[PDB]
Structures are given as C-alpha cells and as structure tokens.
Amino acid sequence: LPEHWTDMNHQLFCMVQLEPGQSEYNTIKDKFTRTCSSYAIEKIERIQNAFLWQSYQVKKRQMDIKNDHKNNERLLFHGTDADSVPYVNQHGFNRSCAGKNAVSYGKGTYFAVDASLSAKDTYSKPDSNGRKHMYVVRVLTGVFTKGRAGLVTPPPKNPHNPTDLFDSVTNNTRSPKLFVVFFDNQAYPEYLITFTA
Amino acid sequence: LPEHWTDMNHQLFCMVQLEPGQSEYNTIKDKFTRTCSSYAIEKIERIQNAFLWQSYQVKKRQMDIKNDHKNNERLLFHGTDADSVPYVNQHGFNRSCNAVSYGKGTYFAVDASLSAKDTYSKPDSNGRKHMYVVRVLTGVFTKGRAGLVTPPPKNPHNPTDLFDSVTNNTRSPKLFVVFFDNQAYPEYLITFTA
Numbered sequence: 001l002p003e004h005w006t007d008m009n010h011q012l013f014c015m016v017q018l019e020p021g022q023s024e025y026n027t028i029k030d031k032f033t034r035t036c037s038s039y040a041i042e043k044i045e046r047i048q049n050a051f052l053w054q055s056y057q058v059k060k061r062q063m064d065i066k067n068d069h070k071n072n073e074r075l076l077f078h079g080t081d082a083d084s085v086p087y088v089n090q091h092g093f094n095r096s097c098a099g100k101n102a103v104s105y106g107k108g109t110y111f112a113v114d115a116s117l118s119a120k121d122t123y124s125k126p127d128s129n130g131r132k133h134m135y136v137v138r139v140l141t142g143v144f145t146k147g148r149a150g151l152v153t154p155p156p157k158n159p160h161n162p163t164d165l166f167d168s169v170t171n172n173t174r175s176p177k178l179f180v181v182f183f184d185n186q187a188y189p190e191y192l193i194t195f196t197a
Numbered sequence: 198l199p200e201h202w203t204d205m206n207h208q209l210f211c212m213v214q215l216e217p218g219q220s221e222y223n224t225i226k227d228k229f230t231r232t233c234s235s236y237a238i239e240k241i242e243r244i245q246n247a248f249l250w251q252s253y254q255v256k257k258r259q260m261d262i263k264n265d266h267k268n269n270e271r272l273l274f275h276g277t278d279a280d281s282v283p284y285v286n287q288h289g290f291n292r293s294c295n296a297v298s299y300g301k302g303t304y305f306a307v308d309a310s311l312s313a314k315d316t317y318s319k320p321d322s323n324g325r326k327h328m329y330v331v332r333v334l335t336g337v338f339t340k341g342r343a344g345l346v347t348p349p350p351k352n353p354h355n356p357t358d359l360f361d362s363v364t365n366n367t368r369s370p371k372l373f374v375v376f377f378d379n380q381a382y383p384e385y386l387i388t389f390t391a
C-alpha cells in the first residue's frame with residue numbers, strides 16, 4: 001500500500017477527505033476546473049481500497065511487462081449516480097453495470113479525458129440534494145485503437161491472431177476524449193469529487 | 198509459480214501436454230472418469246498462464262482474508278466450444294462472452310458429466326470435445342436466480358458485502374456461477390470424444 005495513505009489499522013477500506021491548499025487536493029481541483037470551472041467542489045476524497053489497489057497494481061505490472069516501454073496509465077474521469085458510489089468505492093468499475101453510451105465504442109466502462117464530459121447530468125446524475133459525483137481514476141489504457149459499438153472486449157491487434165488484444169479502445173486515436181475498458185481491475189477509483197452547480 | 202509447472206524457458210504462457218500414467222495425469226483423469234468413464238480422453242494439457250495465475254492468486258489471498266478461515270476454492274469443470282479455447286487459455290473466463298438462469302456469470306459444473314453435454318463442450322468438426330478443469334473461488338455462496346449481474350448481498354443492510362458466487366442448490370450444489378474476472382483459473386484442458 002502507498003506510504004502516504006492514512007493508516008487504516010487493519011481496515012481494508014477508507015475514504016480520506018482532502019484539505020484545500022494541500023498539493024494533493026489542488027492538483028485534482030485544477031484538473032477538474034480546467035473544463036468544469038462553472039461547477040463548485042464540495043469535497044475531494046482519496047479512496048484507499050487495499051484489495052482494488054492490489055489487483056490493479058498486478059494488472060499494471062503485467063501490462064508494463066507486456067508492452068514496450070509504454071505509458072500504460074492515464075488519469076481519467078468517471079461521472080456516476082449516487083446510487084453507484086458505494087459499489088464503486090468498494091468494488092470498482094463493473095462493465096456488467098454500464099449503460100449503453102450515447103456514442104458507443106463498445107460495451108465496457110467509459111472514462112473521460114475531460115471532466116466536462118463526465119460532468120454531464122447523464123453521467124454524474126445530480127442526487128436529491130443536487131450533489132454530483134465524479135471519480136478520478138487511474139486507468140490502464142495501454143495500447144489502444146478506435147472502438148466499435150458491440151465490442152465486448154478490445155479488438156485484436158491482428159486479425160490472424162484473435163487472442164492478442166489491444167488494452168482499451170477510444171473514440172479517436174489522434175485526439176482521444178474517452179477510453180473504454182473491458183476488464184475488472186483495469187481501473188482504480190483514486191479520488192471521489194463531490195460537486196454542485 | 199507452482200512447483201509442478203514445468204520450466205517455461207522465460208515464456209509467460211504455455212500449454213504442456215501431460216504424460217499419461219504419471220501422478221498428475223492420473224489425478225486429473227480420475228476426476229473426469231468419476232462421471233465420464235464412457236468417454237475417450239485424447240490428451241490432458243496443463244495450462245501455465247503466469248499472468249492469469251498471478252491475478253487469481255491475488256483474489257484467492259483476498260478471499261481467504263475477507264472470509265477468515267474458509268475453504269474458498271473448489272475444482273470444477275467447464276465445457277466449451279473449440280473456438281473459445283484459445284481465448285480461455287490466454288485470458289481465462291469472461292462473463293461478457295447458453296442459458297444464464299442462475300445469473301449472467303461464468304458457469305462451472307461439479308460433475309464432468311454436466312460439462313460433457315454437447316450444448317457446452319460442443320463437438321468440433323472432428324468430433325473432439327473440450328472441457329477445462331478449473332480452480333474456482335466459490336467462497337461463501339447462495340442460491341442464484343435469473344438476471345443477477347453480481348452475487349446477492351449477504352444482508353441487504355450492507356448491500357456491498359456480497360456472496361462470492363451463486364449455485365443452483367446450497368445444500369447439494371451441482372453448478373456454480375462467478376461474476377468477476379480472475380475468480381477462476383483454467384488449470385487443465387481435457388480433449389476427449391464420446
């Protein structure tokens with residue numbers, strides 16, 4: 001477990017409320033406000049989930065081995081409804097719970113480059129108190145290609161070797177704005193931003 | 198990486214054909230012939246997939262912690278078509294890829310004879326059928342039902358603390374369904390005929 005996490009004393013899960021003015025809070029706030037400056041942040045919590053981290057880091061090490069000196073990890077956003085927050089906090093991102101996207105590049109979990117995308121009410125649905133929720137997520141995008149509706153895994157790199165797959169897919173490889181991942185533990189929910197109009 | 202695996206020559210995936218009449222082949226054959234003695238075994242292969250094993254073992258260590266003094270693993274069978282074999286060997290089981298009456302997960306049989314049905318181990322254009330012997334983290338389980346995308350919660354007061362798998366009958370299970378990647382490791386592939 002990372003050394004700057006708070007001591008969980010044998011607990012395996014904790015949400016840690018960050019302080020404004022700390023670099024950790026400010027970097028996330030800046031990343032969000034880059035495209036969402038009309039919204040206001042209520043709080044930013046660091047998600048410390050030991051099991052999700054372990055499984056994710058194993059996948060990352062594997063992808064770092066398999067890929068040739070790639071930057072396999074991107075820090076992306078994911079807007080979701082209040083009802084999904086307890087599940088994501090404990091269990092991460094489950095493709096089986098994902099709705100069809102308005103522009104589908106495949107049946108998987110969607111992550112945005114820009115917070116403005118995840119800030120749409122269709123993703124970060126405002127709760128009964130008007131709070132919207134967006135995760136900041138370490139995502140193993142790896143080597144990617146343009147996706148296609150109806151993918152249930154990323155496509156093969158080579159049609160003559162159907163089992164050797166891209167790591168994720170995107171809407172546009174030149175200018176990616178979303179990534180879709182198709183496997184468990186390919187995304188670690190790192191921060192939860194609660195925010196309002 | 199398990200002692201009985203044989204040397205991989207720095208590869209991370211290989212399928213190793215077992216030698217008939219030695220301990221390991223005998224053990225796996227016996228599990229199969231317990232209910233499928235009328236079939237003909239052509240070969241048994243050990244699946245040495247380092248990445249899948251790693252991810253599985255992590256999940257097992259986590260399950261052993263979460264459940265605290267439980268026997269969380271069962272050895273089960275999974276019949277599939279020949280066209281799915283390269284995928285399973287390399288990537289394991291994927292719920293996103295038959296009936297799903299106990300939930301939308303991957304199905305494993307207690308008895309080889311259930312996986313031996315042509316509807317599961319579809320005979321290929323040569324008559325060959327394929328069945329895996331699978332280490333499955335069944336953990337604590339409950340009865341399944343149609344439409345589940347994860348197992349039920351153990352108590353709907355804590356909706357995120359879930360059963361590990363579901364079954365058709367908790368008292369005398371004949372199948373188990375798991376809903377997460379890396380909860381099952383395909384350990385052997387049996388190629389056989391009717």
Ligand SMILES: NC(=O)c1ccc(Oc2ccc(C(N)=O)cc2)cc1
Nearest residue numbers: 274275276298304305306312317372
């Ligand atoms: N692929 C397999 O080996 C396998 C498939 C279905 C399994 O479970 C079921 C067996 C029968 C029924 C049924 N409703 O008759 C449902 C599931 C177990 C294993």
